[model samples]
Target: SDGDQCASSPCQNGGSCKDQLQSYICFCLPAFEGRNCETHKDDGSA
Candidate 1:
């Protein structure tokens, strides 16, 4: 059924995955971001 859209891993903190034809694109790191990167980016000032 599922045809390798990150195989349900769906990127998190140490995110890195890409397979866009239907959908799937996450390249997050450096304290993480958003869009399946699981958020957690707050190192601006306070």
Candidate 2:
């Protein structure tokens, strides 16, 4: 790998990560989704 993609904590919202060659993967916890799992899954009125 050229650089360590997982060196930085790219995943958020209690998400886990996979250190690939040049990119990283995010495996989020429940109710957490998207690239960094920063988006909210639900709301009180939504």
Candidate 3:
């Protein structure tokens, strides 16, 4: 059976979790990006 990888808040920082394929992909707001999209990137005083 396939486990719900996105069952919890895996993606962070207002990011979106695309889904799983033995792993996953996360995309963040235009202000940030990374594995968890929890990093700092932007010039809007972010």
Candidate 4:
């Protein structure tokens, strides 16, 4: 059974999360990285 399911605010840096059948989607910010947006990326081009 599923539990907790993004209840703790998995996504970071103003990102959003969407629940799937057995997984979650992290809609990261433009300069974020990782499955939960736990990292920050400097594209340099930005």
TM-score winner = 4
lDDT of 3 by residue, 1-46 (tens): 1667677858998777777666777877777867877687776752
Candidates' C-alpha lDDT: 0.77, 0.77, 0.74, 0.78
Find the 10 residues in a row with the least total lDDT in model 2.
37-46
Q: What is the lDDT of candidate 2?
A: 0.77
Off by over 4 Å in 4: 1-3, 44-46
Off by over 4 Å in 1: 1-17, 36-46
- TM-score to true structure, per model: 0.27, 0.60, 0.58, 0.67
Displacement of the residue 6 alpha carbon in candidate 1, Å: 13
lDDT tens digits, residues 1-46, model 4?
2666677778887788777756777888677888889899986773
Best by lDDT: 4
* Model 4 residue 24 lDDT score: 78
Question: What does candidate 1's lDDT look like per residue over 1-46, in tens digits?
Answer: 3377787768888677777776788888667777788778778775
- Candidate 4 local lDDT, residue 30: 73
Clashing pairs in 2: none
Instruction: Write the number of the candidate with greater lDDT, choosing between 2 and 3.
Output: 2
Q: Model 2 over residues 1-46: C-alpha lDDT tens digits?
A: 6577667778998777788778788888667767778887765465
